[PDB]
Every structure is written in C-alpha cells, then in structure tokens.
Amino acid sequence: SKGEELFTGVVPILVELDGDVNGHKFSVSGEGEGDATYGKLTLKFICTTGKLPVPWPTLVTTLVQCFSRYPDHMKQHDFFKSAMPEGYVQERTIFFKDDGNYKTRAEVKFEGDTLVNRIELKGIDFKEDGNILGHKLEYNYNSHNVYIMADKQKNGIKVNFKIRHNIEDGSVQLADHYQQNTPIGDGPVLLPDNHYLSTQSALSKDPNEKRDHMVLLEFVTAAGI
C-alpha cells in the first residue's frame, strides 16, 4: 500500500525545532523510534541552546501522527502515511487560554530511512509571569482525542483538539489547537471520513542526562469509525 508499507517495522525518528517565544530564541533536537503497528513512539529531546524558556509540555504536540495505529477496518482513513514518503506540511495555531499563542509550520517526511519532523515555531503575546513563561506547568501530559476532518479543497485534512495542561496550583489550562495538513507531493492521498485519534503520553527524565531534556512515551490509536 506504498505509504503504509514504510511503517510496517520500527522507523527511526529525528525532530528539529527552531523557536522564538516573546523574543526568547531556542532550538530543540530529538531522536527516537516509532512503531505504527502498535501506535507507539519513544523519543528523547534536548534543548540545544541551553535552558528551554517555555515548559516542555507546551511543545509536545509540536514535536509525527503517521505513527498512529489505524486498525485494519479504518486504514482507508490514514492520510498521514498515504502522503509518505514525500511527506506533508503540518501547520498549527495553538491558543493558550488567557495567555499567548504559538504558530507553527513543520515538514514531516522521510530523509532516507529516517522519518524527520522539521519545525519553525513563533510565539507571541505571552505574559512574562503567566503559566508558560513563568514555568508553572506540571511535568506530565494528559490523554486526549484529536479530531480529524477531510479538507478536499486543500487535498489534505483539518484537525482540531484541546490540550489540558496541569498547572502546579491544581488548575488546568487549555491549549486550543487548530491544525491543517497538506501533502508535499503531487500523488494521490487518502482523504478520510471524520474520526479521531486517542492519545496517551508519559513524560520522564533521563537520570544521566545533564542537558535540559524530555523523554516521551506515547500511544496513539485511531478510533470513532
């Protein structure tokens, strides 16, 4: 099935992000492995510029939905893998409630045998003492549902969801995600029926790592036929 065939085993992942939030510039690199047969991702990310000026949980969505597990009765709805290997552009606006926003543009594609996510991130209008620039997020990640619709005119998909970030004072802050994916190549892609991805993620630290970093484990399965 061409695109799907590229994901039948474990695929190595490389992620590269250049960011600027309220003028604070930073870069992140990550590497790990993806196994779409089990909808499973394991990755380690490092801030290559020193200390990250935002909380790691705020970058999780930005830092490869081609690794979702689509059950066999739904594989006709897997846009992400169908665009491979030429890839897709993934664009987002992320609105943090009562605070600033992220705008992101990424290219996700194979570079040789590696699946590569290259991102540019621009954040504006953050409060210097809000939950983001004030580093008030707990170091954890919740479990969400990512809603996917076909966008025939753009030959891609439109995606919407809300991330719930736990805050150290017991509160929860919403991050409203608006997302558009469009193929890079010219070949035909799968335009899905409406459905959603069910996600779970666990964040941890490498006890031998001295750099500012995040270890991530993720399970993602398509559902909602």
CSV table of N, CA and C in Angstrom, one decimal, residues 6-7 11-16 64-67 80-81 83-90 105-119 181-185:
chain,number,residue,atom,x,y,z
A,6,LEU,N,5.9,1.6,4.4
A,6,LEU,CA,7.1,2.3,5.0
A,6,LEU,C,7.0,2.2,6.5
A,7,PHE,N,5.8,1.8,7.1
A,7,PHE,CA,5.6,1.9,8.6
A,7,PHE,C,5.4,0.5,9.1
A,11,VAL,N,10.6,2.5,12.8
A,11,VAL,CA,11.2,3.6,12.0
A,11,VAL,C,11.9,4.5,12.9
A,12,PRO,N,13.1,4.9,12.6
A,12,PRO,CA,13.8,5.9,13.4
A,12,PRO,C,13.3,7.3,13.1
A,13,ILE,N,13.3,8.2,14.1
A,13,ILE,CA,12.7,9.5,14.1
A,13,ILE,C,13.8,10.5,14.4
A,14,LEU,N,13.8,11.6,13.7
A,14,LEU,CA,14.6,12.8,14.0
A,14,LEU,C,13.6,14.0,14.0
A,15,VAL,N,13.8,14.8,15.1
A,15,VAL,CA,13.0,16.0,15.2
A,15,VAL,C,13.9,17.2,15.4
A,16,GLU,N,13.6,18.3,14.7
A,16,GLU,CA,14.4,19.6,14.8
A,16,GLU,C,13.4,20.7,14.8
A,64,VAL,N,4.2,13.7,14.7
A,64,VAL,CA,4.5,12.6,13.8
A,64,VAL,C,3.3,11.7,13.8
A,65,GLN,N,2.1,12.2,13.4
A,65,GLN,CA,0.9,11.4,13.5
A,65,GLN,C,0.8,10.3,12.5
A,66,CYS,N,1.7,10.2,11.6
A,66,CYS,CA,1.9,9.0,10.7
A,66,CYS,C,2.2,7.8,11.6
A,67,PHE,N,2.6,7.9,12.9
A,67,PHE,CA,2.9,6.8,13.7
A,67,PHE,C,1.6,6.3,14.4
A,80,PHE,N,-2.0,10.5,6.9
A,80,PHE,CA,-0.6,10.8,7.2
A,80,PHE,C,0.4,9.8,6.4
A,81,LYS,N,0.2,8.5,6.6
A,81,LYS,CA,1.0,7.6,5.9
A,81,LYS,C,0.9,7.6,4.4
A,83,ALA,N,0.6,10.1,2.5
A,83,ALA,CA,1.4,11.1,1.9
A,83,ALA,C,2.9,10.8,1.9
A,84,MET,N,3.3,9.7,2.5
A,84,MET,CA,4.7,9.3,2.5
A,84,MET,C,5.1,8.6,1.2
A,85,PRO,N,6.3,8.7,0.8
A,85,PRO,CA,7.4,9.3,1.6
A,85,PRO,C,7.7,10.8,1.3
A,86,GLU,N,7.0,11.5,0.4
A,86,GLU,CA,7.3,12.9,0.1
A,86,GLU,C,6.9,13.7,1.3
A,87,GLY,N,5.9,13.3,2.0
A,87,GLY,CA,5.6,14.0,3.3
A,87,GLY,C,4.4,14.9,3.2
A,88,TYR,N,4.2,15.7,4.3
A,88,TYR,CA,3.2,16.7,4.4
A,88,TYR,C,3.7,17.9,5.2
A,89,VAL,N,3.1,19.0,5.0
A,89,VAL,CA,3.2,20.2,5.8
A,89,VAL,C,2.2,20.2,6.9
A,90,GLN,N,2.5,20.4,8.1
A,90,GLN,CA,1.6,20.5,9.3
A,90,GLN,C,1.8,21.9,9.8
A,105,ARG,N,4.9,25.8,11.8
A,105,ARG,CA,4.9,25.2,10.4
A,105,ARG,C,6.0,24.1,10.4
A,106,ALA,N,5.6,22.9,10.1
A,106,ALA,CA,6.5,21.8,10.1
A,106,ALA,C,6.4,21.1,8.8
A,107,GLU,N,7.6,20.4,8.4
A,107,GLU,CA,7.6,19.5,7.3
A,107,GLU,C,7.9,18.1,7.9
A,108,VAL,N,7.0,17.1,7.6
A,108,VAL,CA,7.2,15.8,8.0
A,108,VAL,C,7.5,14.9,6.8
A,109,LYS,N,8.6,14.2,6.7
A,109,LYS,CA,8.9,13.4,5.5
A,109,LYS,C,10.1,12.5,5.8
A,110,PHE,N,10.2,11.5,4.9
A,110,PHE,CA,11.4,10.6,5.0
A,110,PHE,C,12.6,11.4,4.4
A,111,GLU,N,13.7,11.2,5.1
A,111,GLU,CA,15.0,11.7,4.7
A,111,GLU,C,15.8,10.3,4.8
A,112,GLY,N,15.9,9.7,3.6
A,112,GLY,CA,16.4,8.3,3.7
A,112,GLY,C,15.5,7.4,4.4
A,113,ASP,N,16.0,6.6,5.3
A,113,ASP,CA,15.2,5.7,6.0
A,113,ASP,C,14.7,6.3,7.3
A,114,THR,N,14.9,7.5,7.6
A,114,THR,CA,14.5,8.2,8.8
A,114,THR,C,13.3,9.1,8.6
A,115,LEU,N,12.4,9.1,9.5
A,115,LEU,CA,11.2,10.0,9.5
A,115,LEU,C,11.6,11.3,10.2
A,116,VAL,N,11.5,12.4,9.5
A,116,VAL,CA,12.1,13.6,10.0
A,116,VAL,C,10.9,14.7,10.1
A,117,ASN,N,10.9,15.3,11.3
A,117,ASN,CA,9.9,16.4,11.6
A,117,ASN,C,10.8,17.7,11.8
A,118,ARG,N,10.7,18.6,10.9
A,118,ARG,CA,11.4,19.9,11.0
A,118,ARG,C,10.4,21.1,11.1
A,119,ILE,N,10.6,21.8,12.2
A,119,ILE,CA,9.6,22.8,12.7
A,119,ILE,C,10.2,24.1,12.9
A,181,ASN,N,-3.1,20.0,7.5
A,181,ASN,CA,-2.0,19.2,6.9
A,181,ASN,C,-2.3,19.1,5.4
A,182,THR,N,-1.3,19.3,4.6
A,182,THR,CA,-1.4,19.3,3.2
A,182,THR,C,-0.2,18.6,2.6
A,183,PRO,N,-0.4,17.7,1.6
A,183,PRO,CA,0.7,16.9,1.1
A,183,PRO,C,1.8,17.7,0.4
A,184,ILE,N,3.0,17.3,0.5
A,184,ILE,CA,4.1,18.0,-0.2
A,184,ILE,C,4.2,17.5,-1.6
A,185,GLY,N,4.0,16.2,-1.8
A,185,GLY,CA,4.0,15.6,-3.2
A,185,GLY,C,2.7,15.9,-3.9
